Amino acid sequence: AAQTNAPWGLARISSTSPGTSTYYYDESAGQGSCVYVIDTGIEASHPEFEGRAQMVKTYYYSSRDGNGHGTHCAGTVGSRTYGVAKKTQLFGVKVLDDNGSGQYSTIIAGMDFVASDKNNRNCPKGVVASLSLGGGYSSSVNSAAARLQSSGVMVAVAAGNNNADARNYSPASEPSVCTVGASDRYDRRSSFSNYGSVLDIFGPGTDILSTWIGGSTRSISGTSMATPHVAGLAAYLMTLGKTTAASACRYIADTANKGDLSNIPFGTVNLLAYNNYQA
Ligand SMILES: [Ca+2]
Ligand SMILES: [Ca+2]
């Protein structure tokens, strides 16, 4: 399939070169996969989700995304126009309040929730969790992410936007999940993107157009925006059977565009998520 005039990020993840504007992807589009978006919730009523998004869990008075971030990242995972996996099932886990903040314990509970709740969902092609959140290092947040990964969910996490070594952030630093840095449309490491040896992959993270609450759209930046690209990519690849939850981060790194990003510090992978789709 070809989505013309796609968001640059989508076009990039299906391209060996920057600066193209068509997103190419297998029409399976992550059908039969599920992506949990563990964030501020999802405006499931957004027409871009086509009824494929639902809230399954909140730790607040409402499952409504009063913030937009989780709606934005869900849109990059799987909205019809802005999504990588345009047919995946999106499950909203509101671990972040409408200010985008969430206690570590709530975040940990939500990760554990996903690890069990996937047994309540139909995801024959596999389960992904997009964690577009991040705080300072926490062994228990890292361990929660590692349990979620261990349960058979492909966990993508934002490397964080501190322009620092992600070793000091969580769940970015958890080695068994997929820690995602951010790049821009000129294939530079996003100025804010964390880096370091724990990074597994880069995805488009600057000026990512995607869904927003109130049925709108918005372009924002962050490794939090790169994360759903990789999450959506993992769902897409698992639907194609190219990989599994356990192997997806390794597969995405193996098949990434290599050595194409600029301003990658020494020691950080120079890998850009790439769907390897040959139209
Ligand atoms: Ca987003
Ligand atoms: Ca890793």
UniProtKB/Swiss-Prot annotation:
Gene Ontology CC terms: extracellular region
Identification of the protein by name: Proteinase K
Portion of the parent chain present: 106 to 384 of 384
Domain of life according to the entry: Eukaryota
An example Gene Ontology biological process: proteolysis
Reactions accelerated catalytically: Hydrolysis of keratin, and of other proteins with subtilisin-like specificity. Hydrolyzes peptide amides
Bridged cysteine pairs (disulfide): 34-123, 178-249
Domain Peptidase S8: 7-279
Cofactor binding mode and count: Binds 2 calcium ions per subunit.
Family, per entry: Belongs to the peptidase S8 family.
Top-rank EC class of the record's enzyme: hydrolase
Annotated active site: 39, 69, 224
Keywords: Calcium, Disulfide bond, Hydrolase, Metal-binding, Protease, Serine protease, Signal, Zymogen
Catalytic activity, EC: 3.4.21.64
Gene name in the database record: PROK
Claim: Signal is one of the keywords in the record: yes
Cofactor dependence: Ca(2+)
